C-alpha cells in the first residue's frame with residue numbers, strides 16, 4: 001500500500017537491519033527520520049546481501065522496486081514481496097525460504113536465485129513462465145517436472161541437488177547455460193534436441 005503522511009522509517013520497516021538498509025538507500029541520517037511516499041517511490045533497487053535481515057515487512061510500500069539482492073540473510077517468509085509487480089531480478093540465496101506462493105504474481109521477474117535455501121518443492125515456479133535465468137543450486141530438489149513450463153529459460157543452475165531425471169529440460173530450446181554437476185544423472189538423451197548450449201556442467205554425478 002502507501003503512507004499518506006510523513007512517517008519514521010522504523011515505523012514502516014519493523015526489522016532493524018532492514019530499516020537501516022532503507023535508511024542508507026534513501027541517504028537519511030537515522031531510522032528515526034520521517035519519510036514520505038514520494039521518497040519511497042524513488043526506490044527501485046535494494047542491495048542488502050548479508051545484512052542480518054529476518055523480515056522485509058514494509059517493502060510492500062516500495063512499488064517501483066525492480067532489483068532486490070537479499071543473499072545471505074535470515075529470511076523465511078517472503079509474503080511482503082507478493083505485489084511488487086515490477087520485480088525483475090530477485091536474489092535470495094542463503095536464506096530458508098520454502099513457500100514460493102508469494103512469487104506467483106511477479107510476471108516481470110526474469111532472474112530468480114534461491115540457492116542454499118533447503119528447497120525440495122519448486123512446483124510453485126509454474127507461475128513464472130517468463131523466467132529467463134534460474135539458480136537453484138545446493139538444495140534438495142529431485143523432481144524438476146515443473147521446469148518444462150519455463151520455456152524462456154536460457155540460464156539454469158540445478159547443481160548440487162538430487163536430480164536423476166532431466167527429461168523435463170528436453171523442450172527448453174533457449175538454454176545456453178546449464179549447470180547440473182553434483183546430481184544423480186545418468187541419462188542424457190534429454191540434451192539431444194538442445195541447439196544453443198554454450199556452457200554445460202555434468203561432472204561429479206553419483207549414480
Ligand SMILES: [Ca+2]
Pocket residue numbers: 010013014015016
Ligand atoms: Ca524495529
Ligand SMILES: [Ca+2]
Pocket residue numbers: 020024
Ligand atoms: Ca549504514
